[PDB]
Design a protein around this ligand. Structure first.
Ligand SMILES: [Cl-]
Ligand SMILES: [Cl-]
Ligand SMILES: [Cu+2]
Ligand code: NA
Length: 95
């Protein structure tokens, strides 16, 4: 199963408004079937796009519609690996 190994913004870190979120998994994930919920103080934030650029499909780029307002973000993810297996988790961060 795909484990989330790291993100940027990194879990609990503080950053300036990033362009996007990068989620780096122990395995290839499918952009098509993978879900990522981004919420800011308990309100859905608009994700415009999910993509795996590289061919290993290990890094998931999650592009919000707007650049991110300063504050507290919860990421809830439901990965679907290149072998079709579902895993899930969550983490927080701030800008
Ligand atoms: Cl995990
Ligand atoms: Cl959304
Ligand atoms: Cu597995
Ligand atoms: Na199976």
């Amino acid at each position: 199963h795909a484990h989330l190994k790291s993100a940027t913004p990194a879990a609990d870190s503080t950053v300036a408004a990033p362009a996007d979120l990068r989620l780096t998994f122990s395995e290839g994930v499918e952009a098509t079937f993978t879900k990522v919920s981004l919420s800011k103080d308990g309100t859905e934030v608009a994700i415009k796009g999910l993509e795996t650029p590289d061919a290993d499909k290990k890094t998931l780029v999650v592009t919000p519609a707007a650049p991110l307002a300063a504050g507290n973000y919860k990421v809830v993810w439901n990965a679907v690996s290149v072998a079709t297996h579902k895993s899930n988790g969550e983490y927080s961060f701030k800008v």
